[PDB]
Fold:
Amino acid sequence: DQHKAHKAILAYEKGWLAFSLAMLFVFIALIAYTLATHTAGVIPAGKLERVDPTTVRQEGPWADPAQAVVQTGPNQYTVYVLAFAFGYQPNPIEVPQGAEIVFKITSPDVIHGFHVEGTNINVEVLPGEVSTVRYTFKRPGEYRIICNQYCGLGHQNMFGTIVVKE
Amino acid sequence: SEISRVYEAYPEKKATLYFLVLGFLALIVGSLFGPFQALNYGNVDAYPLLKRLLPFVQSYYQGLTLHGVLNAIVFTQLFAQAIMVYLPARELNMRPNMGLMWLSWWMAFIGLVVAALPLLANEATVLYTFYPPLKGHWAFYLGASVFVLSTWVSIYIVLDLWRRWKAANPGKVTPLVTYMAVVFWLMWFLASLGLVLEAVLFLLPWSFGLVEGVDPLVARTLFWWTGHPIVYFWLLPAYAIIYTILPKQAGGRLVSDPMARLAFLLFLLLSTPVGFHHQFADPGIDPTWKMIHSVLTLFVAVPSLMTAFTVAASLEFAGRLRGGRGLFGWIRALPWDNPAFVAPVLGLLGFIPGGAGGIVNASFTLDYVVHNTAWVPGHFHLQVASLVTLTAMGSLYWLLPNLTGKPISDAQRRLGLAVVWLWFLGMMIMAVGLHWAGLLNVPRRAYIAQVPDAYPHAAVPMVFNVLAGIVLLVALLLFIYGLFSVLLSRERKPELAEAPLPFAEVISGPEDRRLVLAMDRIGFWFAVAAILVVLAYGPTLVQLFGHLNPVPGWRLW
Amino acid sequence: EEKPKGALAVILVLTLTILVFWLGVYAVFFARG
Ligand code: HAS
Ligand code: HEM
Ligand code: CUA
Ligand SMILES: [Cu+]
Structure:
């Protein structure tokens, strides 16, 4: 007991670093896997794509919610989504099923969140920057957009809709 | 002058006592919003009630700001200034410089006072992360700045103690508690660079009217430079208490001094270069850098997995010594009738799922499942409001006697144990509901009681949230009564306060001194720490500071 | 004495909690991917 059992403790400690490290690496591995597949398109684009918040809903690709979905390949569509003090334009976003959807989201005011219930889409929207995420919806139906970043008194009420067509 | 001659042989008790009292006062007020918020996540609106008790409260989100700023920033910082100055001072029997210590306290008081004014005036309802371009009163940023900056005076105070003690003992190894304190204050110095740079460059000139706006991506990247390590600044005081005090109150020894040193050394290295894990969902920050900060984040949990075994085995050793018998004999041999001991051990239990949730959160792509849902508060209430707070509540039992004199009566020990078990139990119950409402996509930071039809899939973990609101309301109230009662009840008594804290004897072996020697090259490791920071934030900040996109400020409350 | 059995059982609980939580959310991720 004790000192004799001190040798045991600094040795069991060695096994536990050994084991902790191996399980942490298996996680690193299983993340890696998600990084190499379709699921990875929810990661925001690296590049800085700057815009001007005070202009963004008057001039440019965000100023007309009618013109928010553009077909940008045979099976690809781009959607200019504006997240604003207390809703989303367009409402609804109307996207086909099976298509790569490329969201380009910005704000004219403060930070908002864009969390699409039932998907991994979960990006912060920053006034002056463009959040670009990619996703393919495999199931038609409605998907509520939640704003999950406090933005003011109307926050708990900021929701949107994706309608992805049968 | 003092007939409590205390504060002229050890006046470092006088300062410490002010740090703790003010910190526990912040906890009480900040926490008063707690149960209201728990019932909100329970789909019961109770702000019509609160607004009539506290007529100054304009909204749920003013509540959440005050709750956040007052609990997570202010109580915790003050608990850290107290513990991490006074424990190393006592281990070394030296006096902290008192002109500076009274300054640090004054800088923190002037700070809280100044920040608190616009918060109660509803002029800075921007949450404790104050994300631009939400714009607070200038007095909130200047308050938080001076309040934060009072930790620099504390860093000086401790390195000074260390310099002087080394001078008097050439070739002696830094004693354990002091070693902890030193890596800890050095780690906080690196850490705070970020939030300091966000204030001085951006936030302060913005809100005085000196520039029209701020880049939110940089403001948020500087913030999280400080924002992750700041949780380790909350945790390590408790870890300090847990490593060097708890085992003695438990009957035992710390089973390893190098182990504990190692843990702390590892927090100096890896606590700061990891804040991109709060930005998994930000634009304009390269996916590759997120993968680095993610691997590095998983490394910051290794010291903690070590603490788990090290603490566990110390408790086990104590337990056996106190007649504890089988696989699990040793748990009921621990002093369950002492709140000093119970509060941090319950904290540790809560810590098990709290840490497993952080690991999930840290795993980059897995953070898309849970980011900004109720799951996150689920996670941190298990960490800070449970372990860190409970180690502070339990402190009151062995530290307050030590500082004041006033001994704990049996009915005070008893109320202690009610509080601590109810606090623990309320937190576990709140954790489930918030973890579960999170996986059902309920957002954090929301007055969801105003949209009561909105999250119908969440009806049942919403009952859990109500249940806990009510438990934690009982416990907070039992605490307020208990805390005021430990201070107020007239026991202005002599002896038992002439006390060095119940520090632990430690087990020694042949493989101590070579490890301990290496880890004591503090200048070396701080440089490695500062190099890891540059290598982790540097590439990304160069790009951003070259591409500043200031945007107008908004007030949305 | 010999084996710090207790401590091991603690880190066992730890590990298992960690796995249940991590593998649990890893499945949620794919089911939403
Ligand atoms: C004081 C506070 C906190 C601690 C400590 C903490 C620990 C971790 N967290 Fe966290 N956290 C995250 C990852 C981690 C990781 C990897 C750890 C690790 O350090 C944890 C390692 C811990 C363990 C591996 C547990 C070890 C277990 C022990 C030590 C128990 C032993 C028990 C015994 C001995 C009892 C036995 C006794 C008997 C009697 C049986 C991530 C992701 O990377 C996010 C962002 C999520 C998002 O989307 O924003 C995050 C967000 C937060 C938020 C949000 C801030 C905001 O407003 O956005 C709060 C403030 C917070 C606080 C704290 N966090 N965390
Ligand atoms: C007193 C019992 C408590 C209860 C019932 C309680 C309840 C809650 C709930 C339900 C939330 C989530 C609300 C939301 O995100 O909208 C929350 C937020 C929070 N709590 Fe507590 N809490 C308590 C104590 C504490 C303590 C002691 C601390 C810190 C030491 C703490 C720190 C925080 C922080 C930092 C937030 C998030 C602030 C933000 O998102 O802006 N809580 N609390
Ligand atoms: Cu937009 Cu919350
Ligand atoms: Cu963090």
Notes: The beta strands of chain B are 213-214, 551-552. Residues B 129, 231, 234-235, 277-278, 297, 300-301, 304-305, 307-308, 311-312, 315, 331, 345, 348-349, 351-352, 355, 358-359, 361-362, 367, 371-372, 376, 379-380, 383-384, 388; C 10, 14 surround heme-as (ligand 1) (CB under 6 Å). DSSP finds 19 helices and two strands in chain B. The longest strand of chain B covers residues 213-214.
